[PDB]
Swiss-Prot record:
It is found in: Cell membrane; Cell membrane, Sarcolemma. This is Sodium/calcium exchanger 1. Cardiac sarcolemma (at protein level). The cytoplasmic Calx-beta domains bind the regulatory Ca(2+). The first Calx-beta domain can bind up to four Ca(2+) ions. The second domain can bind another two Ca(2+) ions that are essential for calcium-regulated ion exchange. Belongs to the Ca(2+):cation antiporter (CaCA) (TC 2.A.19) family. SLC8 subfamily.
Amino acid sequence: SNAVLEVDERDQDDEEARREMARILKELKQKHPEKEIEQLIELANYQVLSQQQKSRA
């Protein structure tokens, strides 16, 4: 028998996380030329923090 099992654990990668942050920053900088560097770092960190969310380390 093989038996099917499911895990409730998630893994994080440096290549997938770096490509995701580079896609949101390149799309807001090329589309929104009237936005400053302060508004780009505040909306980028607030979007990845609200989607993943951290309570305990």
